[PDB]
Amino acid sequence: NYMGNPWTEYMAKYDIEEVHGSGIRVDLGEDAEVAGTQYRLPSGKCPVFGKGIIIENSNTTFLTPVATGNQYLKDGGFAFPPTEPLMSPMTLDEMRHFYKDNKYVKNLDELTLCSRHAGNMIPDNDKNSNYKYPAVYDDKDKKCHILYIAAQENNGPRYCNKDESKRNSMFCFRPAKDISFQNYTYLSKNVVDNWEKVCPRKNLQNAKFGLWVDGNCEDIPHVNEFPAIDLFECNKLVFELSASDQPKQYEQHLTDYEKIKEGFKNKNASMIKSAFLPTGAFKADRYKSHGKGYNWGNYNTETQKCEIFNVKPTCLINNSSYIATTALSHPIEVE
Amino acid sequence: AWVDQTPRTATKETGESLTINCVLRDASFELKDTGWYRTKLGSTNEQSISIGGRYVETVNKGSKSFSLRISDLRVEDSGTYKCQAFYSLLLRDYNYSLLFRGEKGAGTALTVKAAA
Structure with missing residues (x-):
């Protein structure tokens, strides 16, 4: 209950x-x-x-x-x-x-x-x-x-x-x-x-993220596994796959609308100023992740595997082969 | 530096007048520009005041002081007023200058009631 x-x-x-x-x-x-x-x-x-x-x-x-x-x-x-x-x-x-x-x-x-x-x-x-x-x-x-x-x-x-x-x-x-x-x-x-x-x-020594299920911490159901010679490399991987607010429709020869979309304010001559603006069925929010992405990793120091996932963890498993890492975390520092 | 804001509290009747004085104290640079902010009694949101009409600002750049006079006070004026100083920064060449957000007064809690 x-x-x-x-x-x-x-x-x-x-x-x-x-x-x-x-x-x-x-x-x-x-x-x-x-x-x-x-x-x-x-x-x-x-x-x-x-x-x-x-x-x-x-x-x-x-x-x-x-x-x-x-x-x-x-x-x-x-x-x-x-x-x-x-x-x-x-x-x-x-x-x-x-x-x-x-x-x-x-x-x-x-x-x-x-x-x-x-x-x-x-x-x-x-x-x-x-x-x-x-x-x-x-x-x-x-x-x-x-x-x-x-x-x-x-x-x-x-x-x-x-x-x-x-x-x-x-x-x-x-x-x-x-x-x-x-x-x-x-x-x-x-x-x-x-x-x-x-x-x-700080990264978590001897800890693995898991899900709380029926009064129990179970493994994360769906993870993607990458080779990683050390913790730093697993952190780099999690950071590469984490929440991104980049216009994932990237341009070619940059137009001013696409310049602003990348987070540019000044073309240095003055300010970048759109004359037409974002218009129509866009919301203006199509590139706001709000923190949604592959923000977490379970690093296995023994298999050298970086087990990366996009659901928030709701407990920790005690396991000596693991370091729990996040895309925000320090690349190296362990506690 | 710090900005000396007076008065701390004001209880006024509708129609009366209020002067908020602010002074930039121990400041390395000069007062370049000023702003005024208010949180209305009811909100928690500090908002930009629009100088004009009954809201009249004087700025003394020589003496690093500035004041806001509100005349014909209305109940809707009620709230906590804060003044803010801005300093200047020259890029090591020029001729463009750049503003810097300085210190802010401790506020003025203004209450405006009618007669009864």
Whole structure:
């Protein structure tokens, strides 16, 4: 009779579609209005551990400031250009000093502080706009980097394929959990201040996700199995298959409507402004995953198999050959 | 920095007047722009006030202070008012500038009743 589950509270933080509510590989869960025009943006309530963007055919890394023709590189990355005074990038001590008169903000955890700090950058001199920029925090540097470019992928292999191919291309890139992003966290404007309690972080040693069925934790019924030499590789796989908000109808020669659809705001000449807009039977929501995807994996350290699945788990099985991992989780860290 | 907002509370009669003063205190940069927000008594949603009509703003950029005067007060004006400061940022070249969302006052709890 009783149909409750004593696992419910413990497992809430693996109910990713609820706590996170957006894409993970690619997060463009919300739309905000800037100066009349509507743009897509990240909106994930949880930090994405390990995630960064890989720029294809460029030396330049993604936390290098965007191209303005000044100090960092030419072609540049995704980060806010230098400013006076410099709000980005900014260290932990530097942030805590800037917000020292604000009791709530000055005591935030490093990750929520960075998202909040980023939240303070005004889009295109629009004072009352809901549009806030995402950000990446680096635990080695202790540096919050504010992202000027909120798009996370553009690489249809018609232009992008060698790594740039033809005569007049501009930016090819994709989200990844590269080994060099291990200390990075991708932070949307919405990262909650209580993430370390409601969001995944560390992978679970000697644990396997399961389903609560008739007072019992049973195996996940339907999993897909991939080879994975180590936990990192299983995490990369889960992250590759996780909730995506990418326009899964990808274009060719990018039109302005398709530019915005990828989460582009500025073609840098000014703002990207659609004259016809999305119209008809579209809803405007056909690429909002709301956190729906293959967000979880059961890594078997013995068979080297990454058992990946798209239903939320509702208990844990004790099994010494397993590590339970999520697409939000740290690529490496185990508890 | 922090923004000093007065008064904290106001009990007014319909038709009366209210001035909310705000001061940007220990601020490295100058006041570049300002905004005003209100949560109506009944809602939990803070919303943009539209300056104009009975809502009149003065901004003193020299002294880093700004104020909102509401005249001919209406019950519908009731709620908690917050002012917000914005700072400027020059990109290391130019000539484009960029706004930054600064500190916000602690609020003004305005109650507006008629006679009885």
